[PDB]
Design a protein around this nucleic acid. Structure first.
Ligand SMILES: Nc1ncnc2c1ncn2[C@@H]1O[C@H](COP(=O)(O)OP(=O)(O)O)[C@@H](O)[C@H]1O
Ligand SMILES: [Mg+2]
Lengths: 754, 788
DNA sequence: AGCTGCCAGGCACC
DNA sequence: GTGCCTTGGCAGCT
């Protein structure tokens, strides 16, 4: 046990699994942390069983831990961002490697999805935009230059990896990026004039390659994510809208929960991506809109077939890495068989892009016929033990099998020859690695074992023998079965050689199939959930009719209530007064969301939506300090094409400081920024604003008082709120009648003064 | 779908289905030979829960039988897994003797492991209580009972309202909760772990009394002062009935019950406990809580007690003074006692296993070891001049006789279990010394017979060996196996060697095996004999463990008082709190800068402080420390300040800033009295400007003028600084700030009077709100300031 | 030292 | 009097 320490040197910053029998023990500083992650005991030992390493691996890997197995030297290493095995990955969630680094000018960024090969790079200018990306992409592993200054950005992130500065040298990166894609220059990818980003990308690429020690011919390109291309959404806005992850960490009662009725895992992952990346370019959208409406009818017929395609993206990765297993080629073939049925259905769909996805989807006939002949219906998990290549694929194999089988058949009749020529009904042939083939007599019966029988193993209640004949046909079995196992593997490896030259076209199929899933889904959702198609206008504005919060309406078993909205440049800002109770917050969020969805190509929960160009979405809807910091970022960055949602700011400090801060903020967003604003507030004094400045208007929520409770409504109406309900609720909440009456007195006296 | 009427099943599955029908909701481990097995549904679940194979074993009444199992020897790993996910398991054992059992061997469920009744070292946590509990509801209140099965501690109580009941669940935090079937307030109990719905009949009062009396050996419950408390007794009844059915043995360590009266201790509510971070930080960890800072006990049974104390402050002026006196006398003796007190270990829980006849060999060895530290504890404490200390030196006994029993009965370091022997020592039982010796002829015998047979046969590969399946043997290699004596009877064959047996050896096989088993049965008989010798003293032993735990706690609090610099507070007759240079006992450690200590004078004439101050000024911390100083004072501990005078305090309320705030606040208005300490922390929420301020006003008014509680009222509303003007008993304090220059500065120092101003704009400016906007908010502020 | 597979002891069934 | 079967232990082969 002294050979562990000297070989920990090899990899210091990584957990070292070490083999001791049927477990993988861990020592020293590494056991404390490994028991503190996986729920096991520390003795400084700690270890796991062999037929479950791949869970106590997938689970350290989930928490940003690279791992290193040790069998004698380090044989396997995994890292959070570089895995591609279906056991280690979560079915419907991206898993990225990222690299980040820092010039004096600003930041360079690069994400890799090792499975899809989806390789993106960006170049955030300021602090908070680098922060917004770290949020959105959620790298499972973060490479960062040692010299990286602003660590408060990535300080507590899981699976951080400090790397030398020289891995972010521009010309080493350029070469290696160009060698990877097979080009002279990266101009065809739109990135040659973007050196910061390319550094991030060169370092990342460098490292991926290392973790794999193979080519990665699925990584054939790179794209850059320009700022002006997307509607920008700060981390806080992403979180408040609950796009994929609800505020409480989970994933239900979220926008994706409602909108994500895709059937392939690769399509779930793509939908979620789109949802986090609304694009400002109406082109791509207007085209998405029209695709989505075309497949309205063809939904029922398409999805159940599309479901059979499966996760063809991730399978295509294990083909590239050459790790793909029997069941993976089997799932690849099953998908090819779907392609013709799908092609038949998209034939009629009159939409130039739907027809493009059918072209891009491919058919792949050779390959479908190839694996139809070369694999059985349902092979076993691994090639390891043969029985995967179908009978009739290759004369030679079949011959070697028929040989083995005729030795099995002999040995069965030998079981019946000896049973007859002994009169002993517990006789039987068996197989075992210890002894090879063997006859076996029960213990009570074993003394009548014929004199030619040679004994070999005394068991508790039986005895085992061998004879020249028996051993001679073992020879026959072992020979055949073994030669034919070696053939299956060679035959199976050749299936890789024939499949790989079409890797390019296949990636394109999975991707076309992936988009087809998403759009077919968005089409079904649009139809089922009574969404309408939003139209786009030139000036900034949001005109909604009977619109809704897409999640709240699916979740609550009370009726939703639909509200209008009418923001234009002549009506930029609504001062929303009245009680809150979620109602005001909902009216706002359904706005952010209806816009988000519009600007993703989806249909929207409303009788009608007109909408202008939006560049950022801000949603302070959630210390006083946080509130003000968030409010600061909004005032510093809103343009007049921003959508800005603000929730009773002022609460938390003094009547007058807050009244004043809120007044000063509304003035600023309405006269200076001129951004389209919903300004929830409680200050009644703010309702004078419409008189004191153009382009502000008053709207409100109200409540009905019946019986023994109070109906907090959901319905926005013109003008200011002429009532308050805090005392109303104090009453229903059990506060002594006399106290309430004293508060009511205090109320009429404080208000009267204003 | 098959009809599975009794007589369609096999004799075995009949026996199973009968026992299983007595445990329909919980897994049944079913001893079948060497394996605990599980069938149907149970197997399906067990398979999912414990990750084990789901298989089949021969249909019974037409349909096949799902099956899952685990060998008997690995049962406790799996009992651990299940108990940790709040699952009960009924253990069914074999009672009979299959060699004289015609049908299936008799089978009785002998125990039931449930999360509130575990008493094994490996299933529990050393520094953390594990309570069973029962709750039930009357038309007019709440009955409630708790057992700590591994010490016998058995309390009962009767909370008057929803919020006190919510306080009591939070405080006690039962791993398991039996609750009556007709319980109304599922808000309290839904979503707790180990929830157990029980039928009304178990909470019937005459039955509770019957059982409880019978367990305690009494005609009535008058001497436990609970004969008065049928609301709570009904809980006890249902608790006990349950314990008995889990354990299925006597429970001699459950000898009394004790009421927890409302007046006997400072009642704090959900909010207050959460917000004082007594044992749980505000995220859920234990890092940096009261208990983290104060808990340097050396035994686990002591760490647990300090935590019950911290959680239930006592209002007995006499218990408190005796406690302070102890922390005083013992201050010099902490360095010597603690290293000795540590070796006592967790005797509390050992005596639990002793009560249940469960204790293992290493349990008795550590009981012996504890006994061995008593004479040195009696020395160290004799010289200490303090009667309370001397009554603990007294109560902790010495136990010279039982110590000499374990020293003669058991070897120094025995194995974990009795099941293989090697526990009882030489000299204790002469019949065992005799049986051991006949069994250990190996010292040179099999070696001698081996060597003499190798020379007689001339067959160098000849070895003697035992293998568990075929007994002893003489082995010969296959090269030489045809040359072996004709006398050698072939016994076991192998690939390259052939083992034989002869009379001389088969006879030594028998001499050895019957004697080894005779010696194990007798040893197991001697071991269980230890329990009957010890058990008679169980009561005086329990009183010892308690003594040593309390000593651990006090010796601790003494050391804590020295190293952290605390002073004995004094108590007074009327309500009031008077702190000179006092600190938050916790936050003055996590901080790597000196803690700005602060004063406080609360009296019946100066009983509400409106507390203003900027955000992050130190307001919440000022209130938190006030309650922790009151909290520590009322456990007998020394306190984090220079001087403290504190009056009686019945209850502590906390509100920290919808329909929930309103209710919480109403509870404070209904149950607060002159003797309560109330912390409103920035309350008052409305749907308009002056909505919520109005309520805070009326609430502050009502608290000052009608309730007359002691009150720390932190506030953002400057409107409330006018309260002293109008209200009697109300005064303004503030946490100082220096805008002075352009920046902030939090001086963290409480001062008299209203604050100079609110700092909202300055704090907004510090957040990075653009200057042009702060400039215009100020233009607006001077607008609003001009009204008055 | 590593991998394979008999064995533990109940009871049902032929 | 052989059948059948969980999991963990370690014997019996390399
Ligand atoms: N007496 C003090 N001395 C030094 N630091 C303090 C003191 N009181 C509070 N603080 C620090 O200031 C922080 C914020 O204090 P806090 O009580 O929350 O102010 P407020 O409640 O008014 O918002 C605390 O977490 C603590 O670290
Ligand atoms: Mg505070």
């Amino acid at each position: 046990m002294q050979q562990y320490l000297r070989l920990k040197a090899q990899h210091p910053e990584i957990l070292l699994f070490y083999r001791m029998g049927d477990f993988y023990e861990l020592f020293y500083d590494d056991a404390k942390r490994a028991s503190q992650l996986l729920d096991i005991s520390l003795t400084p030992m700690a270890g796991i069983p062999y037929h479950a390493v791949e869970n106590y691996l997938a689970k350290l890997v989930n928490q940003g831990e690279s791992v290193a197995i040790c069998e004698r030297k380090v044989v396997r290493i995994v890292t959070p961002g570089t895995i591609s095995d279906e056991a280690l990955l979560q079915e419907r969630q991206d898993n990225l490697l990222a690299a980040i680094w820092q010039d004096s000018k600003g930041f360079g960024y690069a994400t890799l999805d090792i499975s899809s090969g989806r390789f993106r790079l960006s170049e955030p200018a300021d602090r908070e935009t680098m922060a917004a990306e770290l949020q959105r992409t959620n790298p499972a592993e973060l490479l960062y230059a040692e010299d990286f200054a602003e660590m408060s950005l990535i300080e507590g992130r899981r699976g951080l990896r400090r790397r030398p500065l020289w891995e972010f040298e521009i010309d080493t990166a350029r070469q290696q990026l160009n060698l990877q894609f097979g080009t002279r220059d990266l101009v065809g990818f739109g990135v040659e004039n973007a050196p910061r980003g390319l550094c991030a990308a060169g370092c990342l690429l460098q490292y991926a390659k290392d973790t794999q020690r193979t080519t990665l011919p699925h990584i054939r390109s790179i794209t850059m994510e320009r700022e002006q291309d997307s509607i920008i959404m700060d981390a806080a806005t992403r979180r408040n809208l609950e796009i994929t992850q609800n505020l409480a960490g989970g994933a239900e009662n979220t926008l994706a929960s409602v909108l994500d009725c895709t059937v392939t895992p690769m399509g779930s992952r793509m939908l979620k991506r789109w949802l986090h990346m609304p694009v400002r370019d109406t082109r791509v959208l207007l085209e998405r809109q029209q695709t989505i409406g075309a497949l309205q009818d063809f939904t029922a017929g398409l999805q159940p077939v599309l479901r059979q395609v499966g996760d063809l993206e991730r399978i295509l990765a294990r083909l590239a890495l050459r790790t793909a297993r029997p069941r993976d080629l089997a799932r690849m073939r099953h998908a090819f068989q779907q392609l013709p049925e799908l092609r038949a259905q998209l034939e009629t769909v009159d939409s130039a892009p739907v027809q493009a996805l059918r072209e891009k989807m491919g058919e792949f006939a050779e390959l479908r016929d190839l694996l139809e002949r070369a694999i059985i219906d349902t092979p076993p998990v691994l090639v390891r033990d043969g029985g995967v290549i179908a009978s009739g694929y290759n004369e030679e194999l079949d011959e070697w099998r028929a040989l083995a089988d005729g030795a099995t058949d002999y040995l069965e009749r030998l079981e019946v020859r000896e049973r007859e020529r002994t009169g002993l009904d517990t006789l039987k042939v068996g197989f075992n690695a210890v002894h090879g083939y063997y006859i076996q007599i029960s213990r009570g019966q074993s003394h009548l074992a014929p004199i030619n029988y040679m004994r070999r193993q005394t068991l508790k209640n039986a005895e085992r023998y061998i004879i020249p004949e028996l051993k001679e046909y073992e020879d026959k079995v072992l020979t055949s079965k073994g030669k034919a196992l070696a053939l299956e593997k060679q035959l199976y490896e050749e299936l890789f050689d024939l499949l790989l030259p079409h890797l390019e076209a296949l990636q394109q199929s999975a991707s076309a199939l992936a988009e087809l899933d998403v759009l077919v889904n968005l089409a079904e959702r649009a139809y089922t959930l009574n969404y309408t198609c939003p139209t786009f206008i030139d000036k900034p504005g949001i005109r909604i009719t009977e619109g809704r919060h897409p999640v709240v309406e699916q979740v609550l078993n009370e009726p939703f209530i639909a509200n209008p909205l009418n923001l234009s440049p002549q009506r930029r800002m609504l001062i929303i007064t009245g009680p809150n109770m979620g109602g005001k917050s909902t009216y706002m969020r359904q706005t952010a969301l209806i816009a988000l969805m519009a600007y993703i190509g989806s249909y929207v929960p409303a009788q009608k939506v007109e909408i202008g160009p939006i560049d950022r979405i801000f949603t302070r809807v959630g210390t006083f300090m946080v509130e003000m910091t968030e409010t600061a970022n909004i005032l510093h960055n809103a343009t007049e094409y921003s959508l800005v949602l603000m929730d009773e700011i002022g609460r938390g400090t003094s009547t007058y400081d807050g009244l004043s801060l809120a007044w000063a903020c509304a003035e600023n967003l309405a006269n200076k920024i001129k951004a389209l604003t919903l300004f929830a507030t409680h200050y009644f004094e703010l309702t004078q604003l419409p008189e004191k400045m153009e382009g502000v208007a008053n709207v409100h929520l109200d409540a009905l008082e019946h019986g023994d409770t109070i109906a907090f409504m959901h319905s926005v109406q013109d003008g200011a709120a002429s009532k308050s309900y805090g005392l109303a609720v104090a009453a229903l909440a059990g506060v002594p009648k006399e106290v309430i009456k004293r508060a009511r007195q205090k109320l009429r006296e404080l208000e009267s003064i204003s």
